[PDB]
PDB file of C-alpha atoms in Angstrom:
ATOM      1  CA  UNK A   1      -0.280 -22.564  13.291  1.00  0.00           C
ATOM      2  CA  UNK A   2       1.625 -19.548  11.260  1.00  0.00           C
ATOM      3  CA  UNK A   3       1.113 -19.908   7.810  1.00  0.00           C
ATOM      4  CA  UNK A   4       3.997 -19.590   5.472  1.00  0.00           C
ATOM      5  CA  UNK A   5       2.596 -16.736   3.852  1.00  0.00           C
ATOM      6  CA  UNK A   6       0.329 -13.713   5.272  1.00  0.00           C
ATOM      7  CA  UNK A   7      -0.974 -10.902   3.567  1.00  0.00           C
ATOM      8  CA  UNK A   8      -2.438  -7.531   4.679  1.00  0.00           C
ATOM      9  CA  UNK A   9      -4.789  -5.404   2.378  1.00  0.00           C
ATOM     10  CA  UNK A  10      -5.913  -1.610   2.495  1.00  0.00           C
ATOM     11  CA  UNK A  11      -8.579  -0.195   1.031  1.00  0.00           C
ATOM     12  CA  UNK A  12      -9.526   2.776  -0.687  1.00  0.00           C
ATOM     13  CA  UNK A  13     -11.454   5.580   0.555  1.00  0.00           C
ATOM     14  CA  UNK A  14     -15.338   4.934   1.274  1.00  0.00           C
ATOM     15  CA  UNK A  15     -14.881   1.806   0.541  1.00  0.00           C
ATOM     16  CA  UNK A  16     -16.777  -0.332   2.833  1.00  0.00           C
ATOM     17  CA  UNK A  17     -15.009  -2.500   5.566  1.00  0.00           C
ATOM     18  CA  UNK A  18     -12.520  -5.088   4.287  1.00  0.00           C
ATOM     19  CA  UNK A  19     -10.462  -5.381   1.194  1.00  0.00           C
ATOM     20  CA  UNK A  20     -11.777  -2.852  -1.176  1.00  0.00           C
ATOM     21  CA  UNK A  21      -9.772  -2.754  -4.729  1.00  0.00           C
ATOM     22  CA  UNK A  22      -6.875  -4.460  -3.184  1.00  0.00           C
ATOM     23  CA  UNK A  23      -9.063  -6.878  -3.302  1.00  0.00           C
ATOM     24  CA  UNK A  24      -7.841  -8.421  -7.345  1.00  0.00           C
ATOM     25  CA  UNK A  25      -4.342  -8.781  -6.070  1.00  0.00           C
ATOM     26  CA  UNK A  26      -4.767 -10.006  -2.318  1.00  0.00           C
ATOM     27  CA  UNK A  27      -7.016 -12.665  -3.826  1.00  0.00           C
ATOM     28  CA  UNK A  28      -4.638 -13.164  -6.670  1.00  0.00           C
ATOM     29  CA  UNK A  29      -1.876 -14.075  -3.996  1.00  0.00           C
ATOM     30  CA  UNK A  30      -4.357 -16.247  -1.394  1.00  0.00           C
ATOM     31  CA  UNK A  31      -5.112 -18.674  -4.823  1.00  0.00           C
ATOM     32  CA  UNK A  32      -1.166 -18.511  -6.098  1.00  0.00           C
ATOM     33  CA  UNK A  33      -0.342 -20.223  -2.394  1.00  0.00           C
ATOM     34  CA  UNK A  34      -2.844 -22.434  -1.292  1.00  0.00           C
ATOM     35  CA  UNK A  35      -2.779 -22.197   2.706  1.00  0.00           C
ATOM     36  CA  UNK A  36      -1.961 -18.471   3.012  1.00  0.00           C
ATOM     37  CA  UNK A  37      -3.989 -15.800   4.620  1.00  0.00           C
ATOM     38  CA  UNK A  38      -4.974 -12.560   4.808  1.00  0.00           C
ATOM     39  CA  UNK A  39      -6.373  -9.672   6.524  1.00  0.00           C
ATOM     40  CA  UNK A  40      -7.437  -6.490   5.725  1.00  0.00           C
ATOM     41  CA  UNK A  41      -6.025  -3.451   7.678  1.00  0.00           C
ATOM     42  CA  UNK A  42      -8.519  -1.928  10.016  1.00  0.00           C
ATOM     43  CA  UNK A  43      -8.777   1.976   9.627  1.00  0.00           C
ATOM     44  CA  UNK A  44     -11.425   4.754   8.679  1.00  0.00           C
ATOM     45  CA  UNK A  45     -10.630   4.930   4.729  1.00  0.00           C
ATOM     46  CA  UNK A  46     -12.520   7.874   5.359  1.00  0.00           C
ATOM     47  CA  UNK A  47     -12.449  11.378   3.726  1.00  0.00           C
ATOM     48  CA  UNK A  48     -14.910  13.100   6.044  1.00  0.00           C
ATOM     49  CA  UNK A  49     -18.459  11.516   4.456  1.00  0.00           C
ATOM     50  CA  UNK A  50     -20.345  10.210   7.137  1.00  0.00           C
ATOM     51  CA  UNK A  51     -20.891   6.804   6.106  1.00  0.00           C
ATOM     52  CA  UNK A  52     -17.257   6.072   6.682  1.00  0.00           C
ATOM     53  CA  UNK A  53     -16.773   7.726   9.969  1.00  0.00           C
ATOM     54  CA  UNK A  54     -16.648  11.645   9.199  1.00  0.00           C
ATOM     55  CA  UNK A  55     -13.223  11.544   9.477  1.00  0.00           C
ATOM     56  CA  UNK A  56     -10.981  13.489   7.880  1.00  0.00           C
ATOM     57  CA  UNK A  57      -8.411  12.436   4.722  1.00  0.00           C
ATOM     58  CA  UNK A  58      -5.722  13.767   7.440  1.00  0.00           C
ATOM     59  CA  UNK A  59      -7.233  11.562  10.094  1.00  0.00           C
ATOM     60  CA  UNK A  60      -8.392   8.675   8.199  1.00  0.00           C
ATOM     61  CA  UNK A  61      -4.550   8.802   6.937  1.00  0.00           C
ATOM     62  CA  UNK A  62      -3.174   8.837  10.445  1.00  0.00           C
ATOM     63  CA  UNK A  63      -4.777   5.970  11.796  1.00  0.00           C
ATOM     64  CA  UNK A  64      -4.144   4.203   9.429  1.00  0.00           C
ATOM     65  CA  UNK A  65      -0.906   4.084   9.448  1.00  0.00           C
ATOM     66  CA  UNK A  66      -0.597   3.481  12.794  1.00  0.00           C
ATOM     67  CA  UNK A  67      -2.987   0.815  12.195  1.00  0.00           C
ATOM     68  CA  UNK A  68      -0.640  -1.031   9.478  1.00  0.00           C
ATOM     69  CA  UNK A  69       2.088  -0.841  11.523  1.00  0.00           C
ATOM     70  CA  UNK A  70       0.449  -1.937  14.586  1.00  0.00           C
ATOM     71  CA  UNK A  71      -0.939  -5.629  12.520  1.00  0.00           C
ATOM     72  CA  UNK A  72       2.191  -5.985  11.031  1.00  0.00           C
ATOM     73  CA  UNK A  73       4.798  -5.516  13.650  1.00  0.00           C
ATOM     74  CA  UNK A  74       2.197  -7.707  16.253  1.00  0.00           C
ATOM     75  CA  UNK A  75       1.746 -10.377  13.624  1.00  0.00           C
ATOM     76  CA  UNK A  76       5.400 -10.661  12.879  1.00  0.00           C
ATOM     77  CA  UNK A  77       5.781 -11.252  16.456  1.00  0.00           C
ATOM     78  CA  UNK A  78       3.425 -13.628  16.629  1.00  0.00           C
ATOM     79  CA  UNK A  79       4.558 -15.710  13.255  1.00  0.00           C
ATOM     80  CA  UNK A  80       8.483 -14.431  12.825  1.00  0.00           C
ATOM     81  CA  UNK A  81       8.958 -16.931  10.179  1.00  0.00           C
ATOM     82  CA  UNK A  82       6.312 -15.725   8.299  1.00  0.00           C
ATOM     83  CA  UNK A  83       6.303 -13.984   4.614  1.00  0.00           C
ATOM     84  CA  UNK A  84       4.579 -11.018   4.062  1.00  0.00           C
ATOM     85  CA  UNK A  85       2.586  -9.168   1.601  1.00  0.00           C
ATOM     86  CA  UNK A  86       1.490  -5.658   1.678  1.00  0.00           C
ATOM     87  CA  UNK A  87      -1.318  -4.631  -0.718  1.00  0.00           C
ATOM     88  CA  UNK A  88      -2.921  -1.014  -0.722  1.00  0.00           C
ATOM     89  CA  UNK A  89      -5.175   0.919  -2.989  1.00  0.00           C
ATOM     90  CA  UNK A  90      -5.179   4.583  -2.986  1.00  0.00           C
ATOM     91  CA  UNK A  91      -5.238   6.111   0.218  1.00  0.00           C
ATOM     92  CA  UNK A  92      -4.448   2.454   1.315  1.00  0.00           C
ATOM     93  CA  UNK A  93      -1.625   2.559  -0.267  1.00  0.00           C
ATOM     94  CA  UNK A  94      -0.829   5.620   0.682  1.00  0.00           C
ATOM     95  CA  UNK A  95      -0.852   4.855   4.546  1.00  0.00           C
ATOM     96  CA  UNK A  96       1.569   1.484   3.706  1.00  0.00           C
ATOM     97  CA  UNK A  97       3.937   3.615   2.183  1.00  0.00           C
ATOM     98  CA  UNK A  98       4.595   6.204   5.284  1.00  0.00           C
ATOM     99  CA  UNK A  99       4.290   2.705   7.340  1.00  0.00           C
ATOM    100  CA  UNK A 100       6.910   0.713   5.670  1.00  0.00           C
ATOM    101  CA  UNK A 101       9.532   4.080   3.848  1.00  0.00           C
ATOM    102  CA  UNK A 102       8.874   6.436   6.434  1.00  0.00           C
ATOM    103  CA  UNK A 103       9.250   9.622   5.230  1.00  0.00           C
ATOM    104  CA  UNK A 104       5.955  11.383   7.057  1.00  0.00           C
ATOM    105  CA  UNK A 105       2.916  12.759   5.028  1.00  0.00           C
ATOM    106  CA  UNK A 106       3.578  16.472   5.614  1.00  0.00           C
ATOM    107  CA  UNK A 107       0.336  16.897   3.719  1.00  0.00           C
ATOM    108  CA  UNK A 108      -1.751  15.561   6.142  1.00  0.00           C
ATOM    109  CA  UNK A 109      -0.243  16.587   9.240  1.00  0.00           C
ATOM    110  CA  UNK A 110       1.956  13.428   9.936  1.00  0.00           C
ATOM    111  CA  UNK A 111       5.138  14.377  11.443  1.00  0.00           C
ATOM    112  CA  UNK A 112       6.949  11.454  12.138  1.00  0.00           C
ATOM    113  CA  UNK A 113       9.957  10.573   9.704  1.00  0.00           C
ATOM    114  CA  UNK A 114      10.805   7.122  10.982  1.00  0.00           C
ATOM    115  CA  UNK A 115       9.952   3.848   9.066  1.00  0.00           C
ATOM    116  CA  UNK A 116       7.072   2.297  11.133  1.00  0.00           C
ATOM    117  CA  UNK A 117       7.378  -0.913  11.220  1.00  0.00           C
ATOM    118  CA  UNK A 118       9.901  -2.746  13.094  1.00  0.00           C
ATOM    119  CA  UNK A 119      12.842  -4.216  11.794  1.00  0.00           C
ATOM    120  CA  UNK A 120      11.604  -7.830  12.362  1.00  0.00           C
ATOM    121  CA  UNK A 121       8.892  -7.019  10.182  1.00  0.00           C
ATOM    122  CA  UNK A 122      10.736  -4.948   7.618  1.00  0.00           C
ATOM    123  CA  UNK A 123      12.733  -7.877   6.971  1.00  0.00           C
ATOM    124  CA  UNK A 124       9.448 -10.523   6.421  1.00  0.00           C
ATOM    125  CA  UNK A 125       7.491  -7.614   4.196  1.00  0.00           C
ATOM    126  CA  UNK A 126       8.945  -9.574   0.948  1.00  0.00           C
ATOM    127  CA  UNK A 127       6.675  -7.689  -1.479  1.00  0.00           C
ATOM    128  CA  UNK A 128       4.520  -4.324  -1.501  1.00  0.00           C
ATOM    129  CA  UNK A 129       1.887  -3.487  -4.430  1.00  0.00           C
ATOM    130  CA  UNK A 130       0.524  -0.032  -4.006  1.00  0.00           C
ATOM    131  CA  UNK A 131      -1.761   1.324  -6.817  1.00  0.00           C
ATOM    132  CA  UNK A 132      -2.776   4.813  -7.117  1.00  0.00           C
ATOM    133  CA  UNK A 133      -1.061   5.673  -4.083  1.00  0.00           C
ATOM    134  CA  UNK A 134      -0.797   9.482  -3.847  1.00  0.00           C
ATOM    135  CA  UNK A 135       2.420   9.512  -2.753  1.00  0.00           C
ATOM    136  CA  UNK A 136       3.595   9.034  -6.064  1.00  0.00           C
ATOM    137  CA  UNK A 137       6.499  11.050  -7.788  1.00  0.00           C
ATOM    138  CA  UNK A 138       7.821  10.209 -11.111  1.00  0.00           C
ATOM    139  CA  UNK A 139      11.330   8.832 -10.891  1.00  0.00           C
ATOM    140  CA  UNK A 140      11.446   6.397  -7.843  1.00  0.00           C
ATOM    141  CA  UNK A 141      12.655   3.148  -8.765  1.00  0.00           C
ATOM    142  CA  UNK A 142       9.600   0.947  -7.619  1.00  0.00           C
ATOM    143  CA  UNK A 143       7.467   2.962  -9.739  1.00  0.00           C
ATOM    144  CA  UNK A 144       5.348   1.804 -12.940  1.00  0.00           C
ATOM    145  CA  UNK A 145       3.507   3.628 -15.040  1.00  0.00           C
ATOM    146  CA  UNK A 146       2.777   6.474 -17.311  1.00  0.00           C
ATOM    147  CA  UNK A 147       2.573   9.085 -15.186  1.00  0.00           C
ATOM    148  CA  UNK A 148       5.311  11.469 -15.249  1.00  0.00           C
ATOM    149  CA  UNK A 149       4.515  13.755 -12.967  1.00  0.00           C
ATOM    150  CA  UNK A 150       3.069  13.279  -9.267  1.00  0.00           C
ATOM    151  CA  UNK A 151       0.332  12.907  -7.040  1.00  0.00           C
ATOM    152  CA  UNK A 152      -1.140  15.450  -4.420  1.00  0.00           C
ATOM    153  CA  UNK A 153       0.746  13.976  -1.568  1.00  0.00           C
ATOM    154  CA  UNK A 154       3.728  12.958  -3.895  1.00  0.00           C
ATOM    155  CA  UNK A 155       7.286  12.407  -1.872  1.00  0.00           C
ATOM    156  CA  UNK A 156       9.921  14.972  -2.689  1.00  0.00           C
ATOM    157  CA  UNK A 157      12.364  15.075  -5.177  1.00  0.00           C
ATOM    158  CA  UNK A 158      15.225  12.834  -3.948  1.00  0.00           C
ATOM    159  CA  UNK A 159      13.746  10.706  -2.161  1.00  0.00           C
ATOM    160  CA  UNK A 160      14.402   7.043  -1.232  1.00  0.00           C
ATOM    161  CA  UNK A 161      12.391   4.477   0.559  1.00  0.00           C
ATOM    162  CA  UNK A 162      14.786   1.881   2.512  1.00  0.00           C
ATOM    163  CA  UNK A 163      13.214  -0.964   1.046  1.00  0.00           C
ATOM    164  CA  UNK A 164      12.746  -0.142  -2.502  1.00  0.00           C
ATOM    165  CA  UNK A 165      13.550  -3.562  -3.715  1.00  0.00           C
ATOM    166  CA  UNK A 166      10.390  -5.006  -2.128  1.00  0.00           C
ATOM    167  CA  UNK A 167       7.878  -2.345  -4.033  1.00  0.00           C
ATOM    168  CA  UNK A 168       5.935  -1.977  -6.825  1.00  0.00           C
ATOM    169  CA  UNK A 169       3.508   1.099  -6.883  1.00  0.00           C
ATOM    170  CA  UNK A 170       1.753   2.063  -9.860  1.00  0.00           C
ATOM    171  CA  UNK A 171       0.249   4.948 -11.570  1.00  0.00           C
ATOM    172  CA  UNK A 172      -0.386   6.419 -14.341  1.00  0.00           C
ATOM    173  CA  UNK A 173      -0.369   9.902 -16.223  1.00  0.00           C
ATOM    174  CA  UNK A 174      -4.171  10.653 -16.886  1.00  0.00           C
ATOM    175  CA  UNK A 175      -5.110   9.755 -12.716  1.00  0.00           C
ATOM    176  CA  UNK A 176      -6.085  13.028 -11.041  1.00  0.00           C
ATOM    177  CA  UNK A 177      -4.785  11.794  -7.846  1.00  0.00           C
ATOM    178  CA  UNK A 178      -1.803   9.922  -7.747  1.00  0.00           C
ATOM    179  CA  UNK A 179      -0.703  11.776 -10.875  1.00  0.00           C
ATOM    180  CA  UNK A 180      -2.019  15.273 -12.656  1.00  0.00           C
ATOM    181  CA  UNK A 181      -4.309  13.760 -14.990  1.00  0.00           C
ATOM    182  CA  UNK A 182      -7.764  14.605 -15.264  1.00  0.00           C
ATOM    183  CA  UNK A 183      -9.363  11.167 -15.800  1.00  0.00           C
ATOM    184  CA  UNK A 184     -11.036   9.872 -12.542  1.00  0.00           C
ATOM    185  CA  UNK A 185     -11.719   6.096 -14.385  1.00  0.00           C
ATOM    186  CA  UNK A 186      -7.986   5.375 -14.450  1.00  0.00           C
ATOM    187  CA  UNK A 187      -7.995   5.351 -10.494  1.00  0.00           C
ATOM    188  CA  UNK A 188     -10.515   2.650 -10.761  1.00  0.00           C
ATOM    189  CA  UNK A 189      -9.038   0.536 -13.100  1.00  0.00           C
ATOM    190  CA  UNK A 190      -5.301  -0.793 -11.734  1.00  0.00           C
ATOM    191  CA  UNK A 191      -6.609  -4.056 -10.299  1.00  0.00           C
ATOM    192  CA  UNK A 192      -7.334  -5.155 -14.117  1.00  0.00           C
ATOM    193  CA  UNK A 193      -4.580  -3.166 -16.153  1.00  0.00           C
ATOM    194  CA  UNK A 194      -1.396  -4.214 -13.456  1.00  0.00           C
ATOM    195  CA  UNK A 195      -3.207  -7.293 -11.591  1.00  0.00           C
ATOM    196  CA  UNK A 196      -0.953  -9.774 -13.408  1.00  0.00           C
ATOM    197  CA  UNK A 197       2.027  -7.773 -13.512  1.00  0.00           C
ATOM    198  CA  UNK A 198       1.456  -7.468  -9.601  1.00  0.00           C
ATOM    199  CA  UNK A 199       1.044 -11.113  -9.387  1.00  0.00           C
ATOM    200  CA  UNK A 200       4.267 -11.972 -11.250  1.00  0.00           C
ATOM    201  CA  UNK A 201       6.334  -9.631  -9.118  1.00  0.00           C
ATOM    202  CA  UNK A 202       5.327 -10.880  -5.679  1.00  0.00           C
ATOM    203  CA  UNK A 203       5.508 -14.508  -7.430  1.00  0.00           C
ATOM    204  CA  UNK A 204       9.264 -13.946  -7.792  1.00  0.00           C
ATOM    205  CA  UNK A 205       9.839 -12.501  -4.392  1.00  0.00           C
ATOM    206  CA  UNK A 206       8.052 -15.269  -2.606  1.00  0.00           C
ATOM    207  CA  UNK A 207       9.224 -18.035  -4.267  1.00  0.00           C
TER     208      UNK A 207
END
């Protein structure tokens, strides 16, 4: 049987297979909605070190995204009635955001502008948490945080993602990666500093 509630998790680079640090808020959801599910997106997470693959950011990246569109869109299909819950950390957030706002990553070589998932699923993907996602630009309405500036894949200036409403991405100003900073803890630390505020938000989209 479809449950009413599904959620998909990427992790960060290196991290070993399954959830990584999306890990605080995928769990967070499963235990907020007793009978839900999850999975965890299948994809390199990879940043050319061996033990994840040797592939390349720009790789790694690639697959990935089609890999989160590929379990979303074939889920949706098979459960239509289905809510769903995107969670990604760092580069996995970073591949759920070209998958669900489109956009491309010219930075890594993908080319492709549309929105990748389909419009079933589009409509089903009721929240999105991506933290440390280095897409991020200061100044898109889903964001939260203290970082002002951007991140080294950060969308251009004017930008808008389609389904803005559904998103919460955070970041903050001393992260090297999805901001300028020059603190590598603060990438590490979102699951505890925005866990609950997560939580809450995808509380009040689910119902």
């Amino acid at each position: 049987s479809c449950p009413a509630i599904h959620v998909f998790g990427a992790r960060e680079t290196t991290a070993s297979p399954g959830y990584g640090s999306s890990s605080t808020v995928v769990n967070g959801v499963l235990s907020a909605y007793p009978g839900s599910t999850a999975e965890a997106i299948n994809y390199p997470a990879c940043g050319g070190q061996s033990s994840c693959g040797g592939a390349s950011y720009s790789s790694s990246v690639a697959q990935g995204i089609a890999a989160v569109a590929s379990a979303v869109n074939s889920f949706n299909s098979q459960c239509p009635s289905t809510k769903i819950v995107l969670v990604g950390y760092s580069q996995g957030g970073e591949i759920m955001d070209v998958a669900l706002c489109g956009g491309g990553d010219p930075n890594q070589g993908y080319t492709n502008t549309a929105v990748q998932l389909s419009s079933s699923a589009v409509n089903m993907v009721k929240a999105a948490i991506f933290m440390g996602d280095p897409m991020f630009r200061a100044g898109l309405s889903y964001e939260v945080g203290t970082c002002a500036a951007g991140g080294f894949d950060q969308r251009p200036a004017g930008f808008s993602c389609p389904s803005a409403a559904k998103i919460k991405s955070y970041c903050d100003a001393s992260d090297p990666y999805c901001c300028n900073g020059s603190n590598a803890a603060t990438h590490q630390g979102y699951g505890s500093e925005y866990g609950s505020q997560a939580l809450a938000f995808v509380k009040s989209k689910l119902g």
